[PDB]
Amino acid sequence: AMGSSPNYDKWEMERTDITMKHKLGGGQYGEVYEGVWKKYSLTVAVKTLKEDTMEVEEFLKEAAVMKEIKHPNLVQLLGVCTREPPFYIITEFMTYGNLLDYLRECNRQEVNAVVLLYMATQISSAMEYLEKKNFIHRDLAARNCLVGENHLVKVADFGLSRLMTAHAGAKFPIKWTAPESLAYNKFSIKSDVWAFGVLLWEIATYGMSPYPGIDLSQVYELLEKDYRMERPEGCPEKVYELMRACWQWNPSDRPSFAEIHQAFETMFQE
Ligand SMILES: Cc1ccc(NC(=O)c2ccc(CN3CCN(C)CC3)c(C(F)(F)F)c2)cc1OC1CCN(C(=O)c2cccnc2)CC1
Ligand SMILES: Cc1ccc(NC(=O)c2ccc(CN3CCN(C)CC3)c(C(F)(F)F)c2)cc1OC1CCN(C(=O)c2cccnc2)CC1
Ligand SMILES: [Cl-]
């Protein structure tokens, strides 16, 4: 080791081997960059921090959790540089970028209703895995999902949410946040389930904004009154039923991600 210690972390990579390219989205997505891992001529994505102003503890924790996560539908950690600044987390680069823009911009003949269902199933799978691990995503939404080759979809976290092609709701995603989370700041797997229902709606609509035309300040009250978004055109009724289950007021009454993944397989008869 450079530090002369016998402790080591295999994930820690040499920063000299990374070439830092342009910020993704030209800065709309925070401190995330395209980069090249020169050793493999491999395009990669790199997240960094600005440490004087940012929470280093949170970054280190993020790096740590990512080391524990392996699934086909979860973004793949490649390495970290977390001994000293600048701090980096390095992941795979997903060719087609975030799901929200992809839905908005896609050819609907290719990306038809069936493909939308496939995207949902893939996300369901990822969430089932996180649930088993007892990890809470805390910011599930289309903007945080990624699209790869072969219509592959992965759950990720850009890290923009501040809750303690614009994407206006990225910082304060009130429209994705369960009522208990809003009122009492309780975030849980069950609150992720609520968000998942919103994400299903985003998918079903090809990326429309939720609760269209409704002010942020009126969302909680509407939910409390037992109002919910309507079934999208072309959304299968069974999928809508699932969304509605995800949006039960009491968290206890929402399905588990295990049940949700099971429902998808079963629901259309096989
Ligand atoms: C560079 C980078 C580093 C780390 C991350 N971190 C994660 O995605 C991430 C972090 C924590 C976690 C999990 N935690 C989430 C927070 N919870 C409180 C705890 C659990 C996850 C996941 F939910 F998937 F398990 C993902 C994302 C990063 O960048 C993202 C994903 C990769 N990117 C692309 O593939 C990309 C995006 C847009 C255009 N081109 C490529 C860029 C944006
Ligand atoms: C942009 C925004 C829009 C709406 C809301 N919240 C609500 O509309 C809302 C939430 C709970 C509630 C209801 N609760 C009010 C509080 N009671 C203890 C429980 C019931 C209501 C309402 F009063 F109408 F019923 C409304 C919060 C919003 O933002 C806050 C900013 C501060 N928050 C932060 O996480 C935060 C704080 C400090 C630094 N960074 C983020 C929480 C989200
Ligand atoms: Cl800084």
Kindly report the three-state secondary structure assignment for every residue of 227-261. Answer: CCCCCCCCCCHHHHHHHHHHCCCCHHHCCCHHHHH
- Best residue among 54, 55, 172 to mutate for probing ligand 2's pocket (most ligand atoms within 8 Å of CB) is 172
Give every strand in the sheet of 88-92, ordered side by side.
18-23, 32-37, 42-48, 88-92, 77-81
Residue 87, SS3?
coil
Q: Is 23 in the pocket of ligand 1 (CB under 6 A)?
A: no
Resolution in A: 1.5
SS3 at position 262:
helix
Tell how far CA 254 is from the center of its chain: 20
Question: What is the rounded CA–CA span in Å between residue 210 and residue 226?
Answer: 16
Neighbours of 10 (CB within 10 A): 7
CB 106 within 8 A of CB 188: no
From the CA of 163, give the closest atom in ligand 2. Answer: 35
Name the method of structure determination: X-ray
Q: Give the position of tokens 């990579």.
A: 13
CB count in 10 Å sphere of residue 44: 20
Q: What DSSP string describes 160-206?
A: --------TTSSS-GGGS-HHHHHH----HHHHHHHHHHHHHHHHTT
Of 100, 97, 98, nearest to 207 by C-alpha is 100
Q: What is the DSSP letter of 30?
A: S
Of the candidates 52, 101, 139, 226, the residue annotated as catalytic is: 139
- Catalogue all structural domains in the chain, each as residue range(s) with its CATH number: 1-93 (3.30.200.20), 94-270 (1.10.510.10)
For the question of residue 226 being annotated catalytic, the response is: no
Bridge partner residues of 44 (DSSP) = 35, 92
d(CA 112, CA 115): 5
Q: Which residues of 181-210 are buried (b: 16+ CB within 10 A; e: fewer)?
A: bbeeeebebbbbbbbbbbbbbbbbbbbebb
Per-residue burial over 63-95, b if 16 or more Cβ lie within 10 Å, else e, is beebeebebebbbebbbbbbeeeebbbbbbbbe
Instruction: Report the alpha-carbon distance of residue 187 to residue 137 in Å, rounded.
Output: 9
Separation CA 92–CA 149 (nearest Å): 13
Annotate 236-258 with b (16+ C-beta within 10 A) or e (fewer): beebbebbebbbbeebeebbebe
